[PDB]
Amino acid sequence: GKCKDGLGEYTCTSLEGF
Amino acid sequence: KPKLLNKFDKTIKAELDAAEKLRKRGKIEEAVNAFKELVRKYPQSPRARYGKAQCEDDLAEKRRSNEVLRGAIETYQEVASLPDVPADLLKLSLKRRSDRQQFLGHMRGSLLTLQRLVQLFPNDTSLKNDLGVGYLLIGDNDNAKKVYEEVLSVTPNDGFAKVHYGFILKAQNKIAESIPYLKEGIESGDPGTDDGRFYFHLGDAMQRVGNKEAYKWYELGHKRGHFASVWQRSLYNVNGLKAQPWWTPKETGYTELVKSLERNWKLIRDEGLAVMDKAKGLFLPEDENLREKGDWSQFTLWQQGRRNENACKGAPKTCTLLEKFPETTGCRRGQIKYSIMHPGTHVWPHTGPTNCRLRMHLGLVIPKEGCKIRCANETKTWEEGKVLIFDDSFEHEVWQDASSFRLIFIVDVWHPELTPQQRRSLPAI
Ligand SMILES: O=C(O)c1ccnc(C(=O)O)c1
Ligand SMILES: [Br-]
Ligand SMILES: [Mn+2]
């Protein structure tokens, strides 16, 4: 589930760490 | 207020306080060693173990190290394994463990902790809300929905559960049903309800049902700093980037990319048509619930700055042509893709996730009439062999009312004002 054209996902980034 | 000392820890409060005072003064290195000393001497002490964890946590901040924080995560777990742990300390330790697991990106591990927290504290509503978030982060909307349904049956007025229930409903295309939950949840003012996501989706849901009140919520979101403007409603933004709906090639500075697309547009078209004829499965339907009606599919060559090797088999010359332009192939917040749209199609007004990209549309097969795209308050049409450029973080809308298919090529580029360091560091979208 990725945000390509819209903002449908609860979070669009998958951050890890500092 | 919070009682963190069991019977025995009260007898060693002086030692525990002496160590804690060192940590509060930022003397992390000394405080770590002091609590490690207390852990060896009092291996069953929950407060001694919690202090070791907190000191490891603060050390990760000062060091900016993941591995230091990962060690703290295990120590926070160790606190919960000890005997006779006070309830306040038990909750603080495992909550901070979850929060730091999510910070590091360990969403699956954060869930287990959150499930355990709910089992240990069945009457804490806020922990159930936190569990629902845990589910939403791994993409488990079904379980997240149950959690917020459970919360709302016990606490119908919980605003946090409402916005999140509304958000889940809207993602399920239950547009009408989501509106009262999103609206009542934001109006509640509870902690966590003042979030751009709920403003963004409440206004979208209203637009889809014909409610004219949608833009009032856009204005309020803008007024509370979630949206750069009423028209530009992206949520993953780098502030200060020039914001306008439509761009010219000169304004973007990517003139060489544009020239290459327009000069070679026929080969780009032909490889797309060959995929349509002999490998149509490579075109995948749009899967973001952006259509009111119609047929819309995309054939993606690059996403999040990563080349799709198998996809490029179908457009090898196009992929070779684009390799020369890292401003698009390296755009980890954009894609490169063919987009086919057929008659009878209407794309809801919508906004992209980030203001860090610009969108280039190269016309490949454009029927004479029926195809148009609106960005902000201005509507334009494609042309075969010509590039349109717009900032899709502005609201935009598309129609297809021709008598045959419309094919375009979409090339995303970094916002020109983004620095090289920013282009390398910004998380991918
Ligand atoms: O391919 C399209 O017609 C389309 C529709 C809506 N949005 C976009 C976009 O590039 O953001 C493209
Ligand atoms: Br294939
Ligand atoms: Mn779009």
mmCIF file with all atom_site columns, N, CA and C in Angstrom, chain B residues 111-163:
data_model
loop_
_atom_site.group_PDB
_atom_site.id
_atom_site.type_symbol
_atom_site.label_atom_id
_atom_site.label_alt_id
_atom_site.label_comp_id
_atom_site.label_asym_id
_atom_site.label_entity_id
_atom_site.label_seq_id
_atom_site.pdbx_PDB_ins_code
_atom_site.Cartn_x
_atom_site.Cartn_y
_atom_site.Cartn_z
_atom_site.occupancy
_atom_site.B_iso_or_equiv
_atom_site.pdbx_formal_charge
_atom_site.auth_seq_id
_atom_site.auth_comp_id
_atom_site.auth_asym_id
_atom_site.auth_atom_id
_atom_site.pdbx_PDB_model_num
ATOM 1   N N  . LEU B 1 111 ? 3.153   -3.951 17.450 1.00 0.00 ? 111 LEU B N  1
ATOM 2   C CA . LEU B 1 111 ? 1.829   -4.540 17.617 1.00 0.00 ? 111 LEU B CA 1
ATOM 3   C C  . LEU B 1 111 ? 1.794   -5.479 18.814 1.00 0.00 ? 111 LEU B C  1
ATOM 4   N N  . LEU B 1 112 ? 2.685   -6.475 18.824 1.00 0.00 ? 112 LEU B N  1
ATOM 5   C CA . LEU B 1 112 ? 2.725   -7.440 19.919 1.00 0.00 ? 112 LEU B CA 1
ATOM 6   C C  . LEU B 1 112 ? 2.735   -6.739 21.272 1.00 0.00 ? 112 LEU B C  1
ATOM 7   N N  . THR B 1 113 ? 3.584   -5.719 21.420 1.00 0.00 ? 113 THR B N  1
ATOM 8   C CA . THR B 1 113 ? 3.613   -4.955 22.663 1.00 0.00 ? 113 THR B CA 1
ATOM 9   C C  . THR B 1 113 ? 2.256   -4.323 22.945 1.00 0.00 ? 113 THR B C  1
ATOM 10  N N  . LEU B 1 114 ? 1.618   -3.762 21.915 1.00 0.00 ? 114 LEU B N  1
ATOM 11  C CA . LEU B 1 114 ? 0.330   -3.105 22.108 1.00 0.00 ? 114 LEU B CA 1
ATOM 12  C C  . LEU B 1 114 ? -0.762  -4.110 22.449 1.00 0.00 ? 114 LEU B C  1
ATOM 13  N N  . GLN B 1 115 ? -0.736  -5.288 21.823 1.00 0.00 ? 115 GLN B N  1
ATOM 14  C CA . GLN B 1 115 ? -1.681  -6.334 22.203 1.00 0.00 ? 115 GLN B CA 1
ATOM 15  C C  . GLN B 1 115 ? -1.477  -6.733 23.656 1.00 0.00 ? 115 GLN B C  1
ATOM 16  N N  . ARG B 1 116 ? -0.221  -6.891 24.066 1.00 0.00 ? 116 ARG B N  1
ATOM 17  C CA . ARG B 1 116 ? 0.074   -7.223 25.453 1.00 0.00 ? 116 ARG B CA 1
ATOM 18  C C  . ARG B 1 116 ? -0.421  -6.132 26.397 1.00 0.00 ? 116 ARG B C  1
ATOM 19  N N  . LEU B 1 117 ? -0.214  -4.867 26.028 1.00 0.00 ? 117 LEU B N  1
ATOM 20  C CA . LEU B 1 117 ? -0.674  -3.764 26.867 1.00 0.00 ? 117 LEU B CA 1
ATOM 21  C C  . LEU B 1 117 ? -2.183  -3.813 27.075 1.00 0.00 ? 117 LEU B C  1
ATOM 22  N N  . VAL B 1 118 ? -2.937  -4.137 26.023 1.00 0.00 ? 118 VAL B N  1
ATOM 23  C CA . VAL B 1 118 ? -4.391  -4.190 26.143 1.00 0.00 ? 118 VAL B CA 1
ATOM 24  C C  . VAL B 1 118 ? -4.809  -5.376 27.005 1.00 0.00 ? 118 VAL B C  1
ATOM 25  N N  . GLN B 1 119 ? -4.119  -6.509 26.865 1.00 0.00 ? 119 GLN B N  1
ATOM 26  C CA . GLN B 1 119 ? -4.407  -7.657 27.717 1.00 0.00 ? 119 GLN B CA 1
ATOM 27  C C  . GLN B 1 119 ? -4.149  -7.326 29.181 1.00 0.00 ? 119 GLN B C  1
ATOM 28  N N  . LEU B 1 120 ? -3.033  -6.653 29.466 1.00 0.00 ? 120 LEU B N  1
ATOM 29  C CA . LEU B 1 120 ? -2.698  -6.319 30.846 1.00 0.00 ? 120 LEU B CA 1
ATOM 30  C C  . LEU B 1 120 ? -3.647  -5.280 31.426 1.00 0.00 ? 120 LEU B C  1
ATOM 31  N N  . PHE B 1 121 ? -4.116  -4.341 30.606 1.00 0.00 ? 121 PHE B N  1
ATOM 32  C CA . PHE B 1 121 ? -4.957  -3.235 31.059 1.00 0.00 ? 121 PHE B CA 1
ATOM 33  C C  . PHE B 1 121 ? -6.225  -3.215 30.213 1.00 0.00 ? 121 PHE B C  1
ATOM 34  N N  . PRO B 1 122 ? -7.192  -4.088 30.518 1.00 0.00 ? 122 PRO B N  1
ATOM 35  C CA . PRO B 1 122 ? -8.387  -4.197 29.660 1.00 0.00 ? 122 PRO B CA 1
ATOM 36  C C  . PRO B 1 122 ? -9.323  -2.999 29.711 1.00 0.00 ? 122 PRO B C  1
ATOM 37  N N  . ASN B 1 123 ? -9.253  -2.154 30.738 1.00 0.00 ? 123 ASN B N  1
ATOM 38  C CA . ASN B 1 123 ? -10.169 -1.026 30.863 1.00 0.00 ? 123 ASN B CA 1
ATOM 39  C C  . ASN B 1 123 ? -9.567  0.292  30.391 1.00 0.00 ? 123 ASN B C  1
ATOM 40  N N  . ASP B 1 124 ? -8.321  0.292  29.922 1.00 0.00 ? 124 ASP B N  1
ATOM 41  C CA . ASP B 1 124 ? -7.686  1.509  29.424 1.00 0.00 ? 124 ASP B CA 1
ATOM 42  C C  . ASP B 1 124 ? -8.107  1.724  27.975 1.00 0.00 ? 124 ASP B C  1
ATOM 43  N N  . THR B 1 125 ? -8.921  2.755  27.741 1.00 0.00 ? 125 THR B N  1
ATOM 44  C CA . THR B 1 125 ? -9.403  3.038  26.393 1.00 0.00 ? 125 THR B CA 1
ATOM 45  C C  . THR B 1 125 ? -8.286  3.566  25.501 1.00 0.00 ? 125 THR B C  1
ATOM 46  N N  . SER B 1 126 ? -7.392  4.392  26.052 1.00 0.00 ? 126 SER B N  1
ATOM 47  C CA . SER B 1 126 ? -6.337  4.985  25.237 1.00 0.00 ? 126 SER B CA 1
ATOM 48  C C  . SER B 1 126 ? -5.405  3.926  24.666 1.00 0.00 ? 126 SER B C  1
ATOM 49  N N  . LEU B 1 127 ? -5.202  2.821  25.389 1.00 0.00 ? 127 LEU B N  1
ATOM 50  C CA . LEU B 1 127 ? -4.345  1.758  24.872 1.00 0.00 ? 127 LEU B CA 1
ATOM 51  C C  . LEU B 1 127 ? -4.996  1.029  23.706 1.00 0.00 ? 127 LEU B C  1
ATOM 52  N N  . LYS B 1 128 ? -6.320  0.883  23.726 1.00 0.00 ? 128 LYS B N  1
ATOM 53  C CA . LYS B 1 128 ? -7.015  0.302  22.583 1.00 0.00 ? 128 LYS B CA 1
ATOM 54  C C  . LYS B 1 128 ? -6.878  1.197  21.359 1.00 0.00 ? 128 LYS B C  1
ATOM 55  N N  . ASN B 1 129 ? -7.074  2.505  21.540 1.00 0.00 ? 129 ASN B N  1
ATOM 56  C CA . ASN B 1 129 ? -6.825  3.446  20.453 1.00 0.00 ? 129 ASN B CA 1
ATOM 57  C C  . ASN B 1 129 ? -5.405  3.301  19.918 1.00 0.00 ? 129 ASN B C  1
ATOM 58  N N  . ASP B 1 130 ? -4.422  3.168  20.813 1.00 0.00 ? 130 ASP B N  1
ATOM 59  C CA . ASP B 1 130 ? -3.045  2.966  20.375 1.00 0.00 ? 130 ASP B CA 1
ATOM 60  C C  . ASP B 1 130 ? -2.884  1.644  19.640 1.00 0.00 ? 130 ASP B C  1
ATOM 61  N N  . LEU B 1 131 ? -3.615  0.611  20.061 1.00 0.00 ? 131 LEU B N  1
ATOM 62  C CA . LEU B 1 131 ? -3.572  -0.660 19.350 1.00 0.00 ? 131 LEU B CA 1
ATOM 63  C C  . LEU B 1 131 ? -4.124  -0.513 17.938 1.00 0.00 ? 131 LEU B C  1
ATOM 64  N N  . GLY B 1 132 ? -5.213  0.246  17.783 1.00 0.00 ? 132 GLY B N  1
ATOM 65  C CA . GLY B 1 132 ? -5.749  0.486  16.455 1.00 0.00 ? 132 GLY B CA 1
ATOM 66  C C  . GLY B 1 132 ? -4.738  1.139  15.532 1.00 0.00 ? 132 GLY B C  1
ATOM 67  N N  . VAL B 1 133 ? -3.992  2.119  16.048 1.00 0.00 ? 133 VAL B N  1
ATOM 68  C CA . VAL B 1 133 ? -2.916  2.725  15.268 1.00 0.00 ? 133 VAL B CA 1
ATOM 69  C C  . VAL B 1 133 ? -1.896  1.666  14.871 1.00 0.00 ? 133 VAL B C  1
ATOM 70  N N  . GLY B 1 134 ? -1.518  0.807  15.822 1.00 0.00 ? 134 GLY B N  1
ATOM 71  C CA . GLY B 1 134 ? -0.607  -0.279 15.503 1.00 0.00 ? 134 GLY B CA 1
ATOM 72  C C  . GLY B 1 134 ? -1.060  -1.087 14.304 1.00 0.00 ? 134 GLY B C  1
ATOM 73  N N  . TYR B 1 135 ? -2.362  -1.377 14.225 1.00 0.00 ? 135 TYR B N  1
ATOM 74  C CA . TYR B 1 135 ? -2.886  -2.124 13.085 1.00 0.00 ? 135 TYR B CA 1
ATOM 75  C C  . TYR B 1 135 ? -2.833  -1.296 11.809 1.00 0.00 ? 135 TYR B C  1
ATOM 76  N N  . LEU B 1 136 ? -3.168  -0.008 11.897 1.00 0.00 ? 136 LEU B N  1
ATOM 77  C CA . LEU B 1 136 ? -3.168  0.837  10.707 1.00 0.00 ? 136 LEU B CA 1
ATOM 78  C C  . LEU B 1 136 ? -1.774  0.977  10.108 1.00 0.00 ? 136 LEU B C  1
ATOM 79  N N  . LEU B 1 137 ? -0.729  0.884  10.932 1.00 0.00 ? 137 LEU B N  1
ATOM 80  C CA . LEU B 1 137 ? 0.624   1.089  10.426 1.00 0.00 ? 137 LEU B CA 1
ATOM 81  C C  . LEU B 1 137 ? 1.118   -0.102 9.616  1.00 0.00 ? 137 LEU B C  1
ATOM 82  N N  . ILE B 1 138 ? 0.644   -1.313 9.927  1.00 0.00 ? 138 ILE B N  1
ATOM 83  C CA . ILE B 1 138 ? 1.015   -2.488 9.145  1.00 0.00 ? 138 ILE B CA 1
ATOM 84  C C  . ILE B 1 138 ? 0.047   -2.753 8.000  1.00 0.00 ? 138 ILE B C  1
ATOM 85  N N  . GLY B 1 139 ? -0.965  -1.910 7.819  1.00 0.00 ? 139 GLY B N  1
ATOM 86  C CA . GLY B 1 139 ? -1.922  -2.096 6.748  1.00 0.00 ? 139 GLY B CA 1
ATOM 87  C C  . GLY B 1 139 ? -3.075  -3.022 7.063  1.00 0.00 ? 139 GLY B C  1
ATOM 88  N N  . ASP B 1 140 ? -3.364  -3.269 8.343  1.00 0.00 ? 140 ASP B N  1
ATOM 89  C CA . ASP B 1 140 ? -4.421  -4.197 8.742  1.00 0.00 ? 140 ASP B CA 1
ATOM 90  C C  . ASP B 1 140 ? -5.660  -3.388 9.124  1.00 0.00 ? 140 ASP B C  1
ATOM 91  N N  . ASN B 1 141 ? -6.360  -2.897 8.100  1.00 0.00 ? 141 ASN B N  1
ATOM 92  C CA . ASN B 1 141 ? -7.527  -2.055 8.344  1.00 0.00 ? 141 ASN B CA 1
ATOM 93  C C  . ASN B 1 141 ? -8.683  -2.842 8.949  1.00 0.00 ? 141 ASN B C  1
ATOM 94  N N  . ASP B 1 142 ? -8.792  -4.135 8.638  1.00 0.00 ? 142 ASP B N  1
ATOM 95  C CA . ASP B 1 142 ? -9.879  -4.937 9.192  1.00 0.00 ? 142 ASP B CA 1
ATOM 96  C C  . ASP B 1 142 ? -9.780  -5.019 10.712 1.00 0.00 ? 142 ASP B C  1
ATOM 97  N N  . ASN B 1 143 ? -8.590  -5.321 11.232 1.00 0.00 ? 143 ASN B N  1
ATOM 98  C CA . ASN B 1 143 ? -8.427  -5.411 12.681 1.00 0.00 ? 143 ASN B CA 1
ATOM 99  C C  . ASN B 1 143 ? -8.500  -4.037 13.334 1.00 0.00 ? 143 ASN B C  1
ATOM 100 N N  . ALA B 1 144 ? -7.965  -3.010 12.671 1.00 0.00 ? 144 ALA B N  1
ATOM 101 C CA . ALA B 1 144 ? -8.073  -1.657 13.205 1.00 0.00 ? 144 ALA B CA 1
ATOM 102 C C  . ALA B 1 144 ? -9.532  -1.243 13.347 1.00 0.00 ? 144 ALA B C  1
ATOM 103 N N  . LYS B 1 145 ? -10.375 -1.651 12.397 1.00 0.00 ? 145 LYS B N  1
ATOM 104 C CA . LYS B 1 145 ? -11.785 -1.283 12.445 1.00 0.00 ? 145 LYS B CA 1
ATOM 105 C C  . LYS B 1 145 ? -12.468 -1.893 13.664 1.00 0.00 ? 145 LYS B C  1
ATOM 106 N N  . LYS B 1 146 ? -12.216 -3.180 13.926 1.00 0.00 ? 146 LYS B N  1
ATOM 107 C CA . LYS B 1 146 ? -12.802 -3.825 15.096 1.00 0.00 ? 146 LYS B CA 1
ATOM 108 C C  . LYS B 1 146 ? -12.391 -3.115 16.380 1.00 0.00 ? 146 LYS B C  1
ATOM 109 N N  . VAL B 1 147 ? -11.112 -2.754 16.495 1.00 0.00 ? 147 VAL B N  1
ATOM 110 C CA . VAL B 1 147 ? -10.623 -2.124 17.719 1.00 0.00 ? 147 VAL B CA 1
ATOM 111 C C  . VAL B 1 147 ? -11.398 -0.842 17.998 1.00 0.00 ? 147 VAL B C  1
ATOM 112 N N  . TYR B 1 148 ? -11.564 -0.001 16.977 1.00 0.00 ? 148 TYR B N  1
ATOM 113 C CA . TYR B 1 148 ? -12.268 1.258  17.182 1.00 0.00 ? 148 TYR B CA 1
ATOM 114 C C  . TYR B 1 148 ? -13.766 1.042  17.337 1.00 0.00 ? 148 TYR B C  1
ATOM 115 N N  . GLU B 1 149 ? -14.303 -0.034 16.760 1.00 0.00 ? 149 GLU B N  1
ATOM 116 C CA . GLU B 1 149 ? -15.689 -0.391 17.039 1.00 0.00 ? 149 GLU B CA 1
ATOM 117 C C  . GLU B 1 149 ? -15.852 -0.812 18.495 1.00 0.00 ? 149 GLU B C  1
ATOM 118 N N  . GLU B 1 150 ? -14.908 -1.597 19.014 1.00 0.00 ? 150 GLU B N  1
ATOM 119 C CA . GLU B 1 150 ? -14.946 -1.973 20.423 1.00 0.00 ? 150 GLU B CA 1
ATOM 120 C C  . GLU B 1 150 ? -14.876 -0.745 21.323 1.00 0.00 ? 150 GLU B C  1
ATOM 121 N N  . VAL B 1 151 ? -14.004 0.208  20.990 1.00 0.00 ? 151 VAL B N  1
ATOM 122 C CA . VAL B 1 151 ? -13.875 1.419  21.795 1.00 0.00 ? 151 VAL B CA 1
ATOM 123 C C  . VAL B 1 151 ? -15.172 2.217  21.774 1.00 0.00 ? 151 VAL B C  1
ATOM 124 N N  . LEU B 1 152 ? -15.765 2.383  20.588 1.00 0.00 ? 152 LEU B N  1
ATOM 125 C CA . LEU B 1 152 ? -16.933 3.248  20.460 1.00 0.00 ? 152 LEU B CA 1
ATOM 126 C C  . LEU B 1 152 ? -18.152 2.673  21.171 1.00 0.00 ? 152 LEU B C  1
ATOM 127 N N  . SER B 1 153 ? -18.254 1.346  21.270 1.00 0.00 ? 153 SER B N  1
ATOM 128 C CA . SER B 1 153 ? -19.376 0.751  21.991 1.00 0.00 ? 153 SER B CA 1
ATOM 129 C C  . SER B 1 153 ? -19.277 1.016  23.487 1.00 0.00 ? 153 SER B C  1
ATOM 130 N N  . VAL B 1 154 ? -18.061 1.090  24.020 1.00 0.00 ? 154 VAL B N  1
ATOM 131 C CA . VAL B 1 154 ? -17.853 1.401  25.431 1.00 0.00 ? 154 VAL B CA 1
ATOM 132 C C  . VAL B 1 154 ? -17.801 2.906  25.663 1.00 0.00 ? 154 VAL B C  1
ATOM 133 N N  . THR B 1 155 ? -17.232 3.651  24.716 1.00 0.00 ? 155 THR B N  1
ATOM 134 C CA . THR B 1 155 ? -17.066 5.101  24.826 1.00 0.00 ? 155 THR B CA 1
ATOM 135 C C  . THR B 1 155 ? -17.497 5.726  23.505 1.00 0.00 ? 155 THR B C  1
ATOM 136 N N  . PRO B 1 156 ? -18.798 5.954  23.318 1.00 0.00 ? 156 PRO B N  1
ATOM 137 C CA . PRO B 1 156 ? -19.266 6.504  22.034 1.00 0.00 ? 156 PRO B CA 1
ATOM 138 C C  . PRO B 1 156 ? -18.744 7.897  21.731 1.00 0.00 ? 156 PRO B C  1
ATOM 139 N N  . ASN B 1 157 ? -18.323 8.662  22.735 1.00 0.00 ? 157 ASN B N  1
ATOM 140 C CA . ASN B 1 157 ? -17.920 10.049 22.534 1.00 0.00 ? 157 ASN B CA 1
ATOM 141 C C  . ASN B 1 157 ? -16.422 10.224 22.309 1.00 0.00 ? 157 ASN B C  1
ATOM 142 N N  . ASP B 1 158 ? -15.647 9.143  22.253 1.00 0.00 ? 158 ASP B N  1
ATOM 143 C CA . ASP B 1 158 ? -14.198 9.256  22.102 1.00 0.00 ? 158 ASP B CA 1
ATOM 144 C C  . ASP B 1 158 ? -13.867 9.788  20.713 1.00 0.00 ? 158 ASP B C  1
ATOM 145 N N  . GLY B 1 159 ? -13.340 11.013 20.652 1.00 0.00 ? 159 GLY B N  1
ATOM 146 C CA . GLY B 1 159 ? -13.080 11.637 19.364 1.00 0.00 ? 159 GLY B CA 1
ATOM 147 C C  . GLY B 1 159 ? -11.957 10.967 18.597 1.00 0.00 ? 159 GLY B C  1
ATOM 148 N N  . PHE B 1 160 ? -10.923 10.506 19.305 1.00 0.00 ? 160 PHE B N  1
ATOM 149 C CA . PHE B 1 160 ? -9.818  9.824  18.641 1.00 0.00 ? 160 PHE B CA 1
ATOM 150 C C  . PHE B 1 160 ? -10.312 8.585  17.906 1.00 0.00 ? 160 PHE B C  1
ATOM 151 N N  . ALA B 1 161 ? -11.137 7.775  18.571 1.00 0.00 ? 161 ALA B N  1
ATOM 152 C CA . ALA B 1 161 ? -11.701 6.602  17.915 1.00 0.00 ? 161 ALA B CA 1
ATOM 153 C C  . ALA B 1 161 ? -12.591 6.992  16.744 1.00 0.00 ? 161 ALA B C  1
ATOM 154 N N  . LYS B 1 162 ? -13.222 8.167  16.812 1.00 0.00 ? 162 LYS B N  1
ATOM 155 C CA . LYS B 1 162 ? -14.146 8.578  15.759 1.00 0.00 ? 162 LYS B CA 1
ATOM 156 C C  . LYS B 1 162 ? -13.406 8.923  14.470 1.00 0.00 ? 162 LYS B C  1
ATOM 157 N N  . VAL B 1 163 ? -12.415 9.820  14.541 1.00 0.00 ? 163 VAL B N  1
ATOM 158 C CA . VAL B 1 163 ? -11.678 10.189 13.332 1.00 0.00 ? 163 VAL B CA 1
ATOM 159 C C  . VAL B 1 163 ? -11.063 8.955  12.691 1.00 0.00 ? 163 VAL B C  1
#
